[PDB]
Symmetry: D3
Subunit: 163 residues, 6 copies
C-alpha cells in the first residue's frame, strides 16, 4: 500500500537548500538561468528528477560540491519531477521569486538552512511523491515586545534589509 | 511518523491564510503586504521561527486576530509555518502580494470554511504540514441552471464580473 | 488524517492535466479566462470543488471530452477547493504563470502528462484533502555528459525552446 | 509634429492613473482588477478604442469618476490611452494588478498632484502621449532631520513600515 | 539640437507588432524564448538594437517575412536598445506578460495591429531615442449602453474570453 | 510642452544606472529594500523626487559616491516623481523585476551603462517631465550568421547565462 519514508537533508554551513516540484526537461536549464542571472557570485548545484523518458537526474552547476549534494538528494528522494538546489554566496530571498516564475515550476516545498527532513510516499514500485517537509523545529514559545524590538534592530542594523 | 489533526477556529467575518516561509523578515514583509493592500484591513500575522530561539513572531493591528494567529501557530507547532487572520478584506485582495513576498514559498489554504490542518510529527519537536482539509466534499455536479445562478451572483451581488 | 486513498488520474494521449487548490466560486471563471486568453485554439475543461454552500463541482469548457475528464477527477478526488484542468493544443508551460497569478489560486499540485496518482486523506466523512501526488517514476540514473549533450540538442533542434 | 498640454482635473480624495493598452477587453479587465483589489473602492475607467468605431469605452461604479475618466480620454484624444479615477483606495492598492493585465503595456502616471499630459499630434486624428508633468520640481535635498520625519510618518501615521 | 522624426510602422493583415526598450545583448534570446514558449504555433520575428559594442540589430525568427519586418523597423527607428516583435498565429495578450517579466525589458511602447507611427528624437549624430507612439486614431465619441452590451456580447459569443 | 532640455547622465565605469518614475514618499524605502535584498554586497545609491509638499530629493544608500550620483541626477532632471538608482557589484538584470514589482513604481525609462541622455520637457517654471531617453547609439548594421554564433558563444562561455 502507501509507505511513508523520511529523508534527511544534509546542509553544510554556509549553504541553503531549495526543494520543489516542476515538470518537463527544460526545468534544469531554466533553473540554471534563474540562478546565474540573479546574483553575480552565486555558487550552486541544481538537480531535477526527469519522471519519464530516460528518467535521469538532470543537473547543472558551477560548484562540484553543490552539484553532488543536489544530485545525491534527488537520488534519495527519488520522486518524479522533484528538483533540488543548493546555493552558496546567495540567500534564497535573492533567487526565490525568479524560481517561482519559471513556467515549469509548480511547487516549492522548502527554502532553508535548518535541519530538514523530507517525507516521501511510495505507492507502487518506483512511484514516489513528496508528502511534505519538516523544516527545523517546533516553537518554544511566543516572542515578547522586547524580542520584537531586537529582531527589528537585527534587520535594520546588521543585515540592513529594513530602515 | 505520527499524523495529527488540528482544528482551525474561524470567527464570522474572518478568513485565514496558512502557509510556509523562512527567515525572520517574513513577519515584517507579510505585515507590509497586508497593510498596503487594502485601506482599513484588520489583521494578525504569526510566523514560526524554526531555529535559534524558535519563538513565534507576530505583527498585527488587531489584538483578537493577533492571538488567533499566535494560537494556531502554537497548535500546528511546525517550523516556518505562518498564519494570517484578516477582517475587512478578502483573501483575493491580498493573496498575490503574499505569493510574491520573497520569504514565502507555500500557501496551504485561504478560506473561511471549516478547516483542518494535517500535521506530521517525525520526532519530538520536529513537525511539518502534510496538507489541509478545506471545507467539505462535493455533493454533486453543477447544472446549467446552477451555472446561471453562479454567474448572476458574481455579476449582481459581488459585481466581480460583468 | 485517519484514512489515505490513492486516486488514479486518467490522461488521454495529447492531453496534460493541471491539479491545484484555490477558494471562492469565482475560481472557475478566472481559470476559464486564464486558459482561453493564453493560447489561440486551446481546448480545455476545468472543474472546481465548491467546499461550502451547495458544494457543487463547478465547471467550464470548450471541449466536452475534457470537461467530463475534469469533472470526473474532481468527483474522485472529492476534496474541497481542489480544481482540475485538462488541456489539448497547449502545454502547461503556455498557461502556468497565468494560473499561478489568479488571486483565488493558492497551490498547484501537478502539471504533467505522466502516469499520475493523487494521495487524498479523509479525516471523516465528506472531509478530504490532498496530501500529495506521485508524478511519473523515480530516477533510473544520473545524466552523463553525453546525455546532457543530447538533452541540449533536443531543446534546441526539436522543440526549439533554446538557442 | 505639434505638442499640446492637457491639464488633469483631480478632485480632493481622488487619484488618477493614466496609461496605454490595446484591445477592447481592456475595459473589462481593468474593471475587474480594481473591484477585486479593495472592498468598497469607487472608480471610473475609460479606454480609447483606436480603430473601428473609435469610441471611448467605460466601466464604473461611481458616475462622477466615470465622467471624469471619459472627459480626460476625450481631451487627450490619443488611441489606446486609458484613464482611471479612484476614491476609497490608493494607487499602491491596485497598481500591480493593473500592471499585470495582459492588455496593459504602459502606465504614464499614478498621482494626486497637479498633473499635465503632453500630447503629440502628427496629423489630424493621430495623437500620442509624449510624457507627463507630475507635480513640481525639487526645492532641495532631504536632510538627516527630514529623513527621520519621513520615516516617522511612514511608521506612525500611515503605518506602512515598522 | 533636438530633432523629431516620425517613423511609419508597416503592419500586414494578420500580424501584430510589439515595440519596446530593453538592454543587454541577452535580450534577443530571452525574447525569443518568451515567444516560443507562450504559444505552440506562433510565427514571429524579433529584432533588438544593441546600443554598444558592435551595435548590431540582433535577431531571431521562425518566419523570414516577420524577421525582415522586425529588422527593417529597427533600422528605421535606429535607437539604442529598442526591440521590435512581429507575430502571427498569436495575439499580444498571449505573450505580453512573459515579455514584461523578461529582466532585460524595461518598457513596452506599443502592442497593436493598427496604423502606427513612432516618434523618434535625434539629439546628436547616431544618438536617438523613442519619444512616444501614435497608436491608431483619436476617439470619435463616447460609447452608449447599447454599445457596451454589444462589446460584452463580442467577448462572450465571438472570442469567448468572458462568460 | 514648451521647452525641451537634454540632461547628460554620468556613468562611472563599473556602475549601471536605472531611471524611472513612481509616486508617494514610500518609494525611496521600497526601492532601497528591493536593491539590498536582491544581491549580497550590492552597493547603491537611490534618490527620488518628491513632487509635492516639501518637494525634497529623498535618498537612501550604502555607498556615498553612488548616493551623490543619484542625488545629483535628480537635481539635474528636476522632474516630479522621477527616481534614479546607481548600482555597483550588481547588474540591472539582478534587480529589475523586483523594481518593476514595487507598487509605487510605474515606469522605468532606462537601465544601462551606456552613454545616456534624458530628454526633459519644461512647460513652465518648476513643472518638468521626462519625454524620453537616448540610450547608447544607433545600429551600425544587421547581425550576420557569424555574428550570431559569436553572440551565442559569448552568452555561453563568457557570462555563462545560457547553456
Amino acid at each position: 500500500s502507501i509507505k511513508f519514508e523520511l529523508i534527511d537533508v544534509p546542509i553544510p554551513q554556509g549553504t541553503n537548500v531549495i526543494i520543489g516540484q516542476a515538470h518537463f526537461i527544460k526545468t534544469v536549464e531554466d533553473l540554471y538561468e534563474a540562478l546565474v542571472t540573479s546574483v553575480p557570485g552565486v555558487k550552486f548545484g541544481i538537480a531535477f528528477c526527469e519522471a519519464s523518458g530516460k528518467r535521469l537526474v538532470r543537473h547543472e552547476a558551477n560548484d562540484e560540491e553543490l552539484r553532488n549534494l543536489a544530485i545525491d538528494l534527488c537520488k534519495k528522494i527519488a520522486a518524479g519531477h522533484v528538483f533540488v538546489i543548493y546555493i552558496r554566496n546567495a540567500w534564497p530571498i535573492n533567487v526565490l521569486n525568479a524560481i517561482k516564475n519559471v513556467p515549469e515550476v509548480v511547487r516549492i516545498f522548502a527554502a532553508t538552512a535548518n535541519p530538514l527532513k523530507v517525507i516521501v510516499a511510495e505507492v507502487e514500485p518506483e512511484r514516489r511523491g513528496v508528502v511534505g517537509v519538516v523544516d527545523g523545529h517546533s516553537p518554544l514559545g511566543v516572542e515578547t515586545e522586547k524580542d520584537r524590538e531586537e529582531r527589528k534592530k537585527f534587520l535594520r542594523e546588521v543585515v540592513k534589509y529594513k530602515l
